Amino acid sequence: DVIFRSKLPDIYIPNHLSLHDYIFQNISEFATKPCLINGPTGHVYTYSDVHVISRQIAANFHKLGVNQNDVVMLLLPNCPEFVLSFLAASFRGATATAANPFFTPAEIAKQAKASNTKLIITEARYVDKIKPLQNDDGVVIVCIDDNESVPIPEGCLRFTELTQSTTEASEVIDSVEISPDDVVALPYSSGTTGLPKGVMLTHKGLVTSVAQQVDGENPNLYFHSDDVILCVLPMFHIYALNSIMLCGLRVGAAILIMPKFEINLLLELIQRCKVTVAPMVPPIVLAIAKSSETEKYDLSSIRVVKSGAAPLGKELEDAVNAKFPNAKLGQGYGMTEAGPVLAMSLGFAKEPFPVKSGACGTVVRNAEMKIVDPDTGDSLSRNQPGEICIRGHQIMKGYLNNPAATAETIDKDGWLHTGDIGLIDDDDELFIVDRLKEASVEEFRNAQRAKGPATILAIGTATPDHCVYQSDYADYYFKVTKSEHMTALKKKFNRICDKSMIKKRYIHLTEEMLEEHPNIGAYMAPSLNIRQEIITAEVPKLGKEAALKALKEWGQPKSKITHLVFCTTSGVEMPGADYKLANLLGLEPSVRRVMLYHQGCYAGGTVLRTAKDLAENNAGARVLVVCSEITVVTFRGPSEDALDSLVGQALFGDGSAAVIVGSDPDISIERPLFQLVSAAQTFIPNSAGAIAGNLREVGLTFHLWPNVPTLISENVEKCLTQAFDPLGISDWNSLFWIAHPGGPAILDAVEAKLNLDKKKLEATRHVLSEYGNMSSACVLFILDEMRKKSLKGERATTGEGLDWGVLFGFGPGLTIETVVLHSIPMVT
Amino acid sequence: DVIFRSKLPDIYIPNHLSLHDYIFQNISEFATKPCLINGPTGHVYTYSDVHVISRQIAANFHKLGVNQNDVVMLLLPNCPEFVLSFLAASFRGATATAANPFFTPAEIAKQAKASNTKLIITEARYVDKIKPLQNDDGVVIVCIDDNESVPIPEGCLRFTELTQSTTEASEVIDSVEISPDDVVALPYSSGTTGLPKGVMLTHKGLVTSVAQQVDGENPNLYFHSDDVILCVLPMFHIYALNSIMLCGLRVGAAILIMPKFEINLLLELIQRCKVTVAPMVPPIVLAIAKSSETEKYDLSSIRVVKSGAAPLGKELEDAVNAKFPNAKLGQGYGMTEAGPVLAMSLGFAKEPFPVKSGACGTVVRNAEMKIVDPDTGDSLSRNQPGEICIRGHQIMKGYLNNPAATAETIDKDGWLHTGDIGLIDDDDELFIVDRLKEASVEEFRNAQRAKGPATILAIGTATPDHCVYQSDYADYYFKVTKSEHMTALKKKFNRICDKSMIKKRYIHLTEEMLEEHPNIGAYMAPSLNIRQEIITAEVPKLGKEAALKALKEWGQPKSKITHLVFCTTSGVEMPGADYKLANLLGLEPSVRRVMLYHQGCYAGGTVLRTAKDLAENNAGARVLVVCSEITVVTFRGPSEDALDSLVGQALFGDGSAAVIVGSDPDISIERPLFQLVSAAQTFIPNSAGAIAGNLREVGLTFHLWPNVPTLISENVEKCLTQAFDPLGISDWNSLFWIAHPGGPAILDAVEAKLNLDKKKLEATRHVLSEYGNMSSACVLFILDEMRKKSLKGERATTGEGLDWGVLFGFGPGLTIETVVLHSIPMVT
């Protein structure tokens, strides 16, 4: 078997006739029955109507300068006007091309120029896309809009002007010359290769493929004249044209025109107009099958559901069978070059043949079809895949003005090569299989993050050189504040300084400075300006000193520092201390900063919490963290009233600490000290105002509740379970401890509450004893001490020999900062 | 082949003799030659010395209450004293156990009690570990320390006291009863199963295994009496004892005692003492082979390198062969229960046999060995793996006071089951194969992070209800500031307000407030206190209003908010605006806060940059970001001097915006608006002081350089390439734009510089025109506008139809914030 044929006999095809003479050959039988129904509005043209009007329109096509064998273009959605214009083009001997109204002035202008369009039938809304071709190219424009009170763009004709009677153009009933090979329809293709080409379909051709379909005693595709054929598919597409319009007309059927598809409108029109034949697409059948709307409308009238250009998945076919028991289903197989039709399901025939699912139907009659091996001319046999070829009078004359591709796709023997591939089984059904054919957010984000836990690489500390010992402090303070007159109060401050558990403290503020700026020593006198002048200059310098120690320990280049977190209690100004420190150190201006101003004693945790996330989320990010505290912000004379301020004056001292935090340590030069595992914050309820401060014209004033130690002790345990429960640790004496030494009273409270071994808070208490309360910097100093003592004493980890640790900050508003640490093993 | 034997004949073994009578049988031949050499110090005991002293020590062992068949314990490193004491124990008829000095009082006390130790020989430094047993258990203690000017713990005897001559104890030359089955050595084992057991090795036994090794005309292990045998292995371990001490002594060899191993000391002692036989361990041979030290010392004297309890990897064996050409290598196979020796390499024999690499040697002579199938009693044959059993007089008498395990490990027929497995090849060499045997930081960290890019879920905005229009503002301002007298200046402010491109602005500060607080309106009068009172109350409230809109849009529970970032220009106080807002909203107290105070107009970028990292690094983290600006901080009267302050008074207005930022949006209710891709910051050089402000007793004062627009325009392009080069985008008109509308002049400058389409800054300029300059909140408002207009106009993305975007903040110190955004597709 080299050559394949239809299972139906050859029929007589009168292809010597002009398309309109053939389509309408039988019109006397159909004359008064409905031909075109415009579904939405209900308008009906009859067969007589269509014939008469189409002829008059040809006649006036002449008047407008359209002559035999020059082209007319149709830019329209489905509508009666489309059919009338096409037929008219044929009656004239002229040629009809169509385009999608939803194209662009570019595609459309291109097609119109390629085809030599001498005129265009469109709606009003599309006229601007074709403006160029109307103005400079002289193309005549016609609008189908029938509303006489709404004007149309100037230079445009009402379609109603072409339906007008003039008998003198009807002496052009001719030509008595109209030839089988004359071109009638000129559709455009996606193409066998690339760029869209004009397909020339002739009178002989179309007459042939229509007869192939609907003609015979047993038609391949059976249409009665009592059928109502739905045409919701685009008429610009050759499928709709041929297999709906031309065929429908030839048989005397009603054609139900839907300008636009919507599922409910479709169901409505089916029930109302009793549509018997529904050509559709897969998206449409899907929509029908999915919707629960079907149960309402009576659909029993549809006897044929034909898929053109679309294959059902056999999930659908079942859905359909349910929704339409009376419907037979099937697919044609089209190609524009092929005329369009090649195979038609024989299930559609008047006396129907068996069909298999997934089949494209059988090749049409009065045609031959072969299956070649690609790149060889050899013909294959049944069930052997291969490029599908067809030959018969119904195929295209050729590509317009392109004999190159015309000879490339239609070979010397007359075979049109589709460029598709398929096989034909024993039952003569044809199956399609294939065609000639055979940095993002998700990544960027994972590239950008960093792999490991944030670790502390280096620590450094700095103090003012001015140092004052507690043994001396009550005296010194009542001296330099010119308060010596209040003896009752100095006697109390003495006790406070003794119970304070502080030995020495390093303090920038000096007696000389108070001689020069007595308003600072005054209990309340406006000091703010001078304090600000002093601390805005000093805080960055002290910060630099510490940052420099840390950077020296770390040993890598400053340019490798990617982030700078700077905490200080006051000295607000802009640009701030972050800018200033970054210029002192000569960091890259591209360093990303966080300026923490007015945070409190808890900020020690805060900066670590801040650096963790910065380091962990940025590849190769190294984070320089600097806390720098100066007490000139906070210093003031005594009053018998505010005892809280007095306690403060005994506890607070100046100091600075700097930490370098990163992820994924190289381990060539870097030495991990601790790991930041989890970081947590909470505030306690009804404690706002327990640790608290206000920036006033007298400087920063601060306040303490007597109950702070108790308030902390209450919540510490909850903080702990909250942080360590995920790690399965209940035993808190197994953790190495770092607590903000807010005051000895807080420490005593906590240890008594959790029953900590007397030695857990040893490092903390050391830092308090030697340096005082440095606010945020404190816990940093303590880490330093811890690791130093752990090294100095040859212990298994940097954590006092133990694996896990906790770091607490405590602050006003009773914000509590809970950081979980992992020690690091030492080589001992 | 059920039973396996040595390739050497059976020899005569005189096991009827006591161990000391056997070892020293031949001493007349050796009497004056060196027996023990203490390597580090050079002291030499001779054979006569050792014999005589050991006997006297037995004699005084009696005086101390040690009687036949009761136990003596040796806690010591390698030293002459160890050998002398062991022999003494044997001479007495007593029994000797040893332990590691490096054990703990627990292990040691346990072993001493288990064994019925009636006395202990140790160094001084270990005496505290045995204090209990000296005091309450009555155990006699002896220290080997010879330094007479340094005392030893009280109740302790000098070892030199046991070497003293007393003839009356020598009437105990006896017993004339000392029996083959009497126990002499009592070492402890890791055990065949679990808990450590005492192994009873008898006189018969040890005499047997020593003869098995060194006796014969062709000894399994060949030692001359001119040999010098290194004993750096622990003498408490039975291997060292048997195969070094006992064997060495039997043959008349010198024994070089190393108390401690160090590689150089070892090489030194080899070269000096001309060590011929070096029993070692794998770690030691490794160390030798690795070190480049060997080339210095003459090692040619070592003729035998014997690995006991360790197998070489044949990488080593080569290293050795190089370092010691003259050395033959081999391994014994020991087990404590086995006496210790089972197999010995026959390469060691006087007339040596062929040996294969990886072999454990051949089973010893006067013994039999079988290979059983485990859990069956069946005997295997050559090259068939199986549990190794041995039988002969050299195996243990049994486990002390444990007939259970004694019968479990030594069966009825007399076979000791090792509990190891191996095979014996055709050549009679034995091979060992096996034994009876057959939540972290890395995770927690990946569990804890969040998968996707930070996205904006919701936005909300709030303003004060008081609104003032620019058309009215010059008048209003000179009115309420009681400045109407300066006409020249009002005329200039008019121009400034006109060129300002602002239409209206929303402003908390009202005329009434200035009637009540004229110091605010005064150009410079102390205002700080009152301003602070007003903004500390207002900023959180306005913030709440906006945060509430955003939270309503988002639609999920407040409890799901995990982080709060709060930016405001001033109003510093503690607890701060973050605390206050968090209580207003009723957020969880465990919400993690960032309080950004005194940041500037750039902080718009800053908060986004801050939230990105917070959201991206925390699983299920949802971040509430609130910027809230009030101009009562910044408001003041005019002066002919500071024009910069005047410009400010025309541009700045109050406002608040709130954003919700998270990673991994659910997509059930959540609706992503933008994505935060990259966030960058930089400062420009020599621009500190171009945008700048200082908090004084008069309120916040601010300053502007005329050149700010130019300074920004210079660096904007660099910022862009820096951010977008990784994304391969050169075309900036393809980005949707958000710029801080610092002033119209800045905008004009930027667009002119990059040549932006007139419409890129449209949204930005709208927000400026409607709201003024809200500082940090501005860019937030702009995003809101952008997405709203993009939706309102049905565009492909939330980004004005475009995929990628840029957000700029600009601030004092010329810090510039560059955020890269990705739009989000809209369903249109």
The CATH architecture assignment of the largest domain in chain A turns out to be 3-Layer(aba) Sandwich
User: Which outline of chain A best applies?
Assistant: elongated
Query: How far is it from the N-terminal to the C-terminal residue of chain A, by CA?
Result: 89 Å
Number of E strands of chain A: 36
Largest interface: A-B, 68 and 68 residues
Could you explain how this protein is built, in words?
- Chains A, B: Its cofactor is Mg(2+).
- Chains A, B: CoA binds at residue 260.
- Chains A, B: Keywords: ATP-binding, Ligase, Magnesium, Nucleotide-binding, Phenylpropanoid metabolism.
- Chains A, B: Pathway: Phytoalexin biosynthesis; 3,4',5-trihydroxystilbene biosynthesis; 3,4',5-trihydroxystilbene from trans-4-coumarate: step 1/2.
- Chains A, B: Belongs to the ATP-dependent AMP-binding enzyme family.
- Two copies of one chain form a homodimer.
- Chain A is α/β, with parallel strands linked by helices.
- Chain A has three domains: 1-438, ANL, N-terminal domain (Rossmann fold, 3-Layer(aba) Sandwich), CATH 3.40.50.12780; 439-672, Peroxisomal Thiolase, Chain A, domain 1 (3-Layer(aba) Sandwich); 673-828, Thiolase/Chalcone synthase (Peroxisomal Thiolase, Chain A, domain 1, 3-Layer(aba) Sandwich).
- The first copy, chain A, is 33% helix and 22% strand.
- Chain A is built from 25 helices and 36 strands.
- In chain A, strands 28-26-29-30-23-31-36-35-34 form a nine-stranded mixed beta sheet, sandwiched between helices.
- In chain A, helix 4 links the parallel strand 3 (71-75) and strand 4.
- In chain A, helix 18 (528-554) packs across helix 19 (577-585) and helix 22 crosses helix 23.
- The first copy, chain A, is elongated, with a radius of gyration of 47 Å.
- Chain A starts with 18 loop residues before the first helix and ends in a 6-residue tail after the last strand.
- Chains A and B meet through helix 13, helix 18, strand 27, helix 19 and strand 28 of A and helix 13, helix 18, strand 27, helix 19 and strand 28 of B.
